[PDB]
Amino acid sequence: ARDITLLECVGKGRYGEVWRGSWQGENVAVKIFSSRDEKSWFRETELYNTVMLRHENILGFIASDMTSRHSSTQLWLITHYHEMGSLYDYLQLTTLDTVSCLRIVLSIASGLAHLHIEIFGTQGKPAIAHRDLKSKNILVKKNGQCCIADLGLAVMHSQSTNQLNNPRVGTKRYMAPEVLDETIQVDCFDSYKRVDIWAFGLVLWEVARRMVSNGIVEDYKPPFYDVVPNDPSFEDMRKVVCVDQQRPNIPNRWFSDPTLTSLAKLMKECWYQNPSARLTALRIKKTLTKID
Ligand SMILES: CN1CCN(CCOc2cc(OC3CCOCC3)c3c(Nc4c(Cl)ccc5c4OCO5)ncnc3c2)CC1
Ligand SMILES: [K+]
Numbered sequence: 001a002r003d004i005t006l007l008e009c010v011g012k013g014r015y016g017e018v019w020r021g022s023w024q025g026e027n028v029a030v031k032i033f034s035s036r037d038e039k040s041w042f043r044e045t046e047l048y049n050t051v052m053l054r055h056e057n058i059l060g061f062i063a064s065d066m067t068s069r070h071s072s073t074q075l076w077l078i079t080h081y082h083e084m085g086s087l088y089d090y091l092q093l094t095t096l097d098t099v100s101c102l103r104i105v106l107s108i109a110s111g112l113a114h115l116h117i118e119i120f121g122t123q124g125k126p127a128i129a130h131r132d133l134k135s136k137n138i139l140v141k142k143n144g145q146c147c148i149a150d151l152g153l154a155v156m157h158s159q160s161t162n163q164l165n166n167p168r169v170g171t172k173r174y175m176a177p178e179v180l181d182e183t184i185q186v187d188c189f190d191s192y193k194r195v196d197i198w199a200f201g202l203v204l205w206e207v208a209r210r211m212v213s214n215g216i217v218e219d220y221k222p223p224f225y226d227v228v229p230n231d232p233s234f235e236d237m238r239k240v241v242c243v244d245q246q247r248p249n250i251p252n253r254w255f256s257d258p259t260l261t262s263l264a265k266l267m268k269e270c271w272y273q274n275p276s277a278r279l280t281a282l283r284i285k286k287t288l289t290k291i292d
Contacts, residue, residue, distance in 0.1 A: 001065055004030055004078065010085065015040075015152075020081060028062060029082070033075035040152030041066075041075040047151050051125045057111030059139060059149040087146060087203070088135040091210050091220045098259050100144050101211040105204055105263065106288040107145040108138060112200060113281040115148070116193050118159060126158040129192030132170045133199035135206050157189040164189060172237050173223060174199045177273050180238040184275075194275040200284070201270025204263055205248045213257035223248050247271050262291055 004021040010029070011018035015037060019030040033041040041064075047053045048061035060080035067074050084090055087104070096104070118127040130148065137150040155165050165186070168179065176198035178184035178191070185191045202223040209218035227246060228236045240246050248267070254260035266287060269279045279287075 001063055001076075001078070004028060006030060015150075016075075021078075023062075023078070027081040027083070029079050031077040031079070033077065035073045035075070037152065038073070038075060041077060043154060044077060044151040047128070047154060047156075051128075051156075052123070053125065053128075053151075055111055055114045055147075057107045057145065057147050058114065059147045059151075082139040082141060082147070084140040084142065086136050086149075087138040087140055087207070090140045091135065091206060094210065095217050096207070096211040098211070101207060102259070102288060102291055103144045104140070104146055104207050106285065108148065108200065108203065109281055109285040109288055111146070111148040112196060113285045115154075116196070116281045118157070120160075126156040126163075127189065127193075129155050129157075129189070130196050130199075131155060131166075131192055132174075133196050133203065134171050134174045135203050138203065155189070155192055165192075168234065170195075170199075172232055172234055173228070174202055175234075175237055175241075176275070177241045178275055180234065181242040191275060193280070194278050197270050197278045197281065197284075198275075200281070201267045202248065204267050204270070208254065208260055208263045208267075209251075211260060213253060213260055216253050218251060245273070259291060262287070 001023065004023040006019045006021050008020050009017055010020050016031060016033045019032065021028045021030045045064040049064065053061065062080060063078040065076045065078070112130070112133070115128040115130055119125045130151070131153040132150055133148070137148065138146050139149050140146055153166065153169050157164060176184070176195045179195060184195070205223060206220070210220060211217065224240055224246070226249075227240045250264050254264050266279070266284060272278050
């Protein structure tokens, strides 16, 4: 709205940049989109202002603005601020106990389940697949819960219509096997929900590594840290996941802990090569609730 005062830059990449801003006394996060990502800015804006997307575990919308002149375009998305930053940065220095670990993973599954499920009525919403789920697109709150942030690559589906993208978009390190070997049924909306579930299982692994049991804990590592380089190519990922049939390694110490044991069983059922065999977000949520 440019009544915002852009204080400090808290993120910078291909997507654009994210600024901590001040708007009427309160802190806000301002994502400044490139002109090359105009379609992503509008899709994310339209979910927020037309679908009325809102949930305790989804990044809170505040405002969206576009100003465009002949030879100038500025694309702003304004949301609630979260001073703890991404789950990725949060896991770097923090360790977790059983309670705070389950609060992180259950809140993520709660937000993902809310995205996936279609709601009917005048105040309803379509089914939504995220398609770029990863630890850098998840923010941590002060209460220890998380929200899902980046909705630019989302796809929607309403049973009341025949409405239905991008071929190979998303972080390659988090791509599902059916995306890498190109067998994904791009015309079934359920394929994108299952691609989100594969990514969710990778994040489960990232978080559980940082949970202490028996005085032990693992350093933060990204998924497949030990078998691919940084910025891995599409081919590197296809060799590791599709050909070598490799999955993130479960430390043996997890099995001495019954909580890390259940999360381990949850990860495996998100990593099936057969996408139809993978759990749904709703089933993951119910399972995580029983653990408490
Ligand atoms: C240097 N540190 C000092 C303090 N602390 C600040 C908290 O950092 C953020 C960063 C955000 O975005 C980054 C998240 C990781 O990937 C790069 C950007 C925040 C954020 N981002 C955001 C996303 Cl991911 C998606 C849509 C958005 C957004 O803001 C406007 O609309 N939103 C809220 N708070 C953030 C705090 C750590 C850094
Ligand atoms: K809040």
